[PDB]
Amino acid sequence: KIPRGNGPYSVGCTDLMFDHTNKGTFLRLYYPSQDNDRLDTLWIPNKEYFWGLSKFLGTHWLMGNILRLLFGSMTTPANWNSPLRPGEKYPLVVFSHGLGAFRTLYSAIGIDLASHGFIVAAVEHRDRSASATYYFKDQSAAEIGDKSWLYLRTLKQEEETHIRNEQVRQRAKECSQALSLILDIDHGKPVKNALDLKFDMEQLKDSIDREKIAVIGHSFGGATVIQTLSEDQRFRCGIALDAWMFPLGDEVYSRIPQPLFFINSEYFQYPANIIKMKKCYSPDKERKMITIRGSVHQNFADFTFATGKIIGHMLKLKGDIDSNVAIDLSNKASLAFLQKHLGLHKDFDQWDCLIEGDDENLIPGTNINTT
Numbered sequence: 001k002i003p004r005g006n007g008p009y010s011v012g013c014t015d016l017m018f019d020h021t022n023k024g025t026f027l028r029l030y031y032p033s034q035d036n037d038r039l040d041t042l043w044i045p046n047k048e049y050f051w052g053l054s055k056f057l058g059t060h061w062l063m064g065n066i067l068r069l070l071f072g073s074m075t076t077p078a079n080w081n082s083p084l085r086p087g088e089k090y091p092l093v094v095f096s097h098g099l100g101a102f103r104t105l106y107s108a109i110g111i112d113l114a115s116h117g118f119i120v121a122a123v124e125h126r127d128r129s130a131s132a133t134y135y136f137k138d139q140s141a142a143e144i145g146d147k148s149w150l151y152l153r154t155l156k157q158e159e160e161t162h163i164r165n166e167q168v169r170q171r172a173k174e175c176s177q178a179l180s181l182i183l184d185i186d187h188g189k190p191v192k193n194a195l196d197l198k199f200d201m202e203q204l205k206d207s208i209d210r211e212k213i214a215v216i217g218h219s220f221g222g223a224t225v226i227q228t229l230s231e232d233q234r235f236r237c238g239i240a241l242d243a244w245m246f247p248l249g250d251e252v253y254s255r256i257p258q259p260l261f262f263i264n265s266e267y268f269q270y271p272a273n274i275i276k277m278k279k280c281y282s283p284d285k286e287r288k289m290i291t292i293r294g295s296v297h298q299n300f301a302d303f304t305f306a307t308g309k310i311i312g313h314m315l316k317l318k319g320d321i322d323s324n325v326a327i328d329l330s331n332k333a334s335l336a337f338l339q340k341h342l343g344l345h346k347d348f349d350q351w352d353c354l355i356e357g358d359d360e361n362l363i364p365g366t367n368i369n370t371t
Ligand SMILES: CC(C)(C)[C@@H]1CC(=O)N(CCOc2ccc(F)c(C#N)c2)C1
Pocket: 053, 097, 098, 099, 100, 101, 102, 105, 218, 219, 220, 221, 244, 301, 302, 303, 304
């Protein structure tokens, strides 16, 4: 089971695609909900994402049907298409997923943020870094739900530098576009969702605190955070979950005015990646780093919850730390960070100690030596 949000709000979830093209926005929305009697949200909602993950794990295509059998009926604890809790303006998080992942696989994070009063827009990237994603070739195709699927691109050694940078820049554009879309919807611009779902987007009208916007993401999405911040000042701070720094150009490091928080796993990081994180530092600017003790790279994503302890540790989905304890630390620290830098009037400052790595399961800064 993926754990429920810890906050006071019930959580809802829906999907939005606009426009219908592979240049449009596709996102999974998590939001504070009015109602709590809806069905829970299907975690991986199409067979082709499993096919996609097979290609990502670089295994027999047949392994996609096994993954489907095991996981295809699993849900995450958010009410599907629940009405939005009215009468309050909610800060907005744009969330960027990792390589081989897609929009649905960071629900633990999305759900918990929503339960504390954020609308979270988990984007699905069309840079071919997602295991799979889909779109519609034309309007008729969208109408009848005739999906066209786009799978992960596998790179040769010598394309790596160039394409990863191309991808991370496409990712930032997609975060910006997704922001512009939600803001248009906040202002009441009628949007026809290309997905034909029973969730009225006009509920979101005047529901976004338009100044209080952040970007968060895992690994390739951690790099996306940084590129996005440098390109788009509407985002007011960012949180990088175990960022993979490779895709970023050398130019960006000195070009991040907004507060930025690195939350790392213990076992993923390495000197080359940390050195790059340290290039983002400047004493005029606001930077924090913590390391979650006993954690692995996958502790930030939902699959850390999909299997048992033993098999989870076997597949490097789980670390020595308990996955719930781990994600609580990451989520609570993030919330403290968000309250400070978006200027929120909540109680998330109770976890200010977490930002500084003051916990038995936290390391301030990093365990990685780079001198
Ligand atoms: C550091 C790299 C190995 C080069 C990549 C860069 C990157 O982005 N990585 C993280 C992916 O995370 C996922 C993927 C698929 C999932 F299904 C899930 C889940 N759940 C997480 C790892």
